Design a protein around this ligand. Structure first.
Ligand SMILES: O=c1ccn([C@@H]2O[C@H](COP(=O)(O)OP(=O)(O)O)[C@@H](O)[C@H]2O)c(=O)[nH]1
Ligand SMILES: O=c1ccn([C@@H]2O[C@H](COP(=O)(O)OP(=O)(O)O)[C@@H](O)[C@H]2O)c(=O)[nH]1
Ligand SMILES: O=c1ccn([C@@H]2O[C@H](COP(=O)(O)OP(=O)(O)O)[C@@H](O)[C@H]2O)c(=O)[nH]1
Ligand SMILES: O=c1ccn([C@@H]2O[C@H](COP(=O)(O)OP(=O)(O)O)[C@@H](O)[C@H]2O)c(=O)[nH]1
Ligand SMILES: [Cl-]
Ligand SMILES: [Cl-]
Lengths: 326, 330, 330, 326
């Protein structure tokens, strides 16, 4: 009697997006009848080899031959923890779905070989984009069955207010996104962060809050910006942005940089604009009229029940398990 | 706040496979949080037009703009009912998934005149789930223009029925009705054919007529060994290359290998998963059953029971129910 | 193979609390694997008798002997509709749970003549879920003879709305309609009353009229502090000792303490869980709000937010939906 | 955001009824959206104190303050494991429901004090019967909120055949039930066991099989016997018999010894007979006519959807969590 299990981290800061994504996916999994394998984030060097082995035995205690396990990677307990977890799993007669949230060596490059080595033990890989799959294959990943995630969902019941404020929201940490501290354009940029830092003139810093609260606020109008530093441009063209799903779930259109992964989703669903640089974005906002905006808003709100009800996640969770067996 | 609803027939004989299929899908759908729109099977001519309209209003009472509806077709209340239900649904600001269980104009040649009306209501859907890519291509030839399609691939068979060890019994199981499958009435081979049917008729010498039994009992009995035969009459060969067989799923869920004819829709599922034999004709199937050895049979059985959790947990159905709704929203 | 179904109204104004309640229960029921029987709110006089009969046939199309049905009453299609629905259900070999949301003959004195007809259809159920033990005792006085009863106790309020820190604001929240709650139009106290209503009317000097907002927004706003008032007009004092207040659940789910009148049904829930104050009259409530200190308020808020996961996860409802079905089967 | 967790053992023999009951309860819990804390049955003496501590940390890794945990006891890892698990749980700001499957010291009496000590750390206790609650209170249990289980469910889709064979079924191990090896009555007793033992004349031993298979067989008619040895009579008047639920789920009436816990369920629902001794039972079967049997069968099949759909378990799982908070 096959039971599907999914790993899920615990113990990170409430402000950790990594943990938010894993927990949200697990909430959806549980609603599909899948079972959680909880993982606490701690300092692995404090375990002896036998203590770590038995801690892992505690985590996997409920597993049986014939099950399927979805490994949400990474655990953020370091590569050693991820390798040793995958080793335990491979002791069972089960199929393993590797669900990639991040590829840390592409964000520590030297750890790529060890990472690829444990990736290859999986039966199916779910990756953010076809470009990321292709990239991993160039580094030796040879898992034959793959599934593309496409987009993060954003389950929520936040009310959507009627939507054209010529301003831009950016719910991201300025320490990770340096372009923030360099903002110089006259259109307002609202930075939602827990960071105790002062920023440029037209940047209006706002304190970190509940997601639900953010979404109501944003649904009133304007534009959502998805953007990365020059340092991270290579990774941005591979990953799925969590803030993208958040803008769309709020019910407003987005502005994303050309090259961002899965851009055809934005294009084919008319969810906003794909632009070359911030200058072109600032232009689009200053220049867009009301009827154009109304059109974009309608597209976004026609599309976003997928995000708000968790369907990107339901489909990858179902298709990956299916592929693992068939 | 989107809800997903799915239509589901009721009121047919217990032995009706059409209803078994819809009900099984609906049970899976409900486990996914989808809601049932129950439809009773009755004689539509007994309603005045306003009575039919208000009966349908009763069926769709819980629907709201912004929902998604999965219409399992046909309802078996006749094409007229199917058309009128789709009309009622299209009055709502919803997306519609058309889940094809059968296509009436293709099942029988004399009913081909219904094709235009069928295509016309089909074309009102946003997504079409069809048994096979070939069925999709054939429907497009007759004018279906729905841009989003999903291939079902195989019927599931959700169950927890125990599987007994499968012995190599040189016998063939066929839980189908002899009135629909004329080849059973002509069986002339020296391999026993076990026919499970409610039909009160005597059958050829080498056919063992077994009385209709509940699906769970059938599964348990079949799991004990032998082979499952999926086969159609000469009149039905075209549909065979198009449809998904329900008994195919049943054999596999029971844990025994199957025998099917070359050209059957979705045959690569059988090949790629090592689930049985694809044969040219009945004569070839008889030769394989007579000539298979114990090791080869153990292997087939291993492949089937390695594969069948997908069926017993309803994953062909979970994946189509999830993907079609996704595609419907875009 | 038993399925459990539950009726659920549709078609009322978004601001209709009756529909909010039924829908909220149904969402919980669906999470438990129960199936919806949708009912649309309409003008019953527009159906001929055969049309109404067949509309109902549409609503119950999916039902089978051996199911259990939970009838949330009233449908608000009038007593006549409620009686006819119960008649249709009693044609099936099923068990029926009657889930009382309101009792029309008790809400208004002039409608007391409806009591006999109401009791007569109530008596067709196998189990009755009622807001309070007092309501059960009162109904038995008017002839209800159903042997199995379940006490609801409190409305849940399933939600994930964020709770802001609750500041001690010396202000009282009342998300109710001034047309139904005349006391709001007479407010003369120096503590501000925040009234959330779609009603286009000006209100007394110390009443802050706030426009109707979606429940999630209301919850978030109320969580910021103050007190929630549950109160009825003099004409409604008898019903108060009988019913469950929906806004009571809303205040608690928002994470603020409440103020209620002595004698309100199920008042021990408030007392035993330290959720607010039970007062003699409005004057006493004003005195408490003026005189409460920060520490005492922090304590109340701690008690409320310790208790409210039961509400936000819908456990009063899960327990009545589970226990009533159990009792129905015996 | 409160999440309900439930413990569940793994690693016992497929023939272990203890594990069957825990797994069945957990399957129902999962359908209610509760989450499993898997526990593997192993030899505790092989762990050092720190290894056991971290194994337990692995088991409870997903827990958070504000959750509710249902502890199905015992784990069968020995009392030390149960005590130390309860200790871990008490480090969290959670409510604990203790769901008693067995009380091992009443089945090792000397371990009662330690057992009662860890029981008392729970917020709510679910016990098989009010008599068991009263008994535990006489040994010092002072948990204020209690819930009575009443009966084991028996979720199943086994077909029920039409039901009057004057024979008696007993799906129980003769090593535990010695009265089996002493059977001497002329009415057939069918013993379903994996035990490789030969038995008296009118005892027809049958090999252990899938439950689903057993139930179809039994639904054809006759009577189900629930009975205990003289050694176990005191415990029988406290516990919930699993085989009782099995007979009823099959769709035939039962014969139980006077004094068995929760006997009013049998009486009030007309599910069979409560008798003084085997002699009276043998009499009832020999003497019952068809119309009486038809009546009993109808009662049983009117009642058994509760068992077959898991409602005794759904109600205790829901009511205990409710009581834990209110
Ligand atoms: O005040 C805030 C600001 C941020 N966020 C959440 O944090 C996310 C952004 O985190 P991150 O930058 O790490 O996501 P990324 O787009 O890089 O994947 C947003 O989508 C929000 O959902 C929030 O809940 N409250
Ligand atoms: O004794 C029986 C015989 C048949 N069936 C059911 O009927 C199905 C076959 O029906 P049908 O021939 O109409 O299906 P098809 O394979 O043609 O799609 C089997 O798989 C069983 O599920 C059954 O339950 N009991
Ligand atoms: O702006 C508003 C005002 C009211 N309500 C809802 O209406 C309920 C109160 O309705 P009613 O007075 O009819 O309920 P009662 O307490 O009398 O049962 C509140 O709890 C809210 O759920 C709302 O959603 N938004
Ligand atoms: O061949 C068999 C015999 C036993 N059982 C199961 O084992 C249970 C009896 O186990 P046990 O005696 O330990 O239960 P108890 O009544 O003592 O609680 C029965 O109810 C059956 O469900 C089974 O599945 N197959
Ligand atoms: Cl992190
Ligand atoms: Cl044991």
């Amino acid at each position: 009697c096959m039971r599907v299990y999914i790993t899920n981290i615990n113990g990170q800061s409430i402000q950790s997006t990594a943990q938010l994504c894993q927990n949200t996916v697990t909430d959806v999994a549980v609603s599909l009848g899948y079972r959680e394998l909880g993982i606490y984030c701690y300092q692995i060097h404090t375990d002896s080899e036998s203590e770590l082995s038995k801690r892992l035995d505690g985590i996997v205690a409920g597993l049986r031959h014939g099950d399927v396990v979805i490994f949400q990677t990474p655990t953020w307990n370091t590569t050693e923890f991820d390798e040793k977890l995958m080793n335990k799993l491979k002791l069972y007669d089960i199929k393993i779905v590797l669900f990639i949230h991040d590829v840390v060596p592409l964000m520590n490059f030297y750890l790529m070989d060890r990472t690829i080595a444990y990736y290859n033990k999986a039966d199916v890989v779910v990756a953010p984009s076809q470009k990321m799959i292709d990239k991993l294959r160039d580094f030796g990943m040879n898992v034959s069955k793959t599934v593309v995630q496409g987009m993060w969902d954003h389950p929520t019941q936040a009310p959507m207010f009627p939507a054209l404020k010529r301003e831009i929201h950016f719910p991201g940490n300025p320490e990770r996104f340096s372009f923030v501290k360099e903002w110089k354009y006259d259109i307002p940029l609202k930075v939602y962060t827990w960071q105790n830092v002062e920023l440029p003139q037209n940047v209006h810093k706002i304190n970190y809050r509940p997601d639900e609260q953010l979404l109501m606020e944003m649904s009133q109008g304007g534009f959502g910006l998805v953007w990365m530093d020059d340092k991270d441009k290579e990774y941005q063209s591979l990953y799925c942005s969590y803030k993208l799903g958040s803008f769309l779930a709020a019910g407003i259109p987005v502005i994303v940089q050309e090259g961002i992964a899965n851009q055809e989703l934005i294009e084919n669903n008319g969810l906003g604009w794909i632009v070359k640089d911030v200058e072109e974005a600032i232009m689009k906002v200053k220049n867009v009229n009301e009827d154009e905006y109304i059109e974009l808003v309608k597209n976004v709100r026609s599309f976003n029940p997928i995000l708000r009800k968790g369907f990107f996640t339901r489909r990858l969770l179902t298709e990956s398990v299916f592929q693992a067996i068939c």
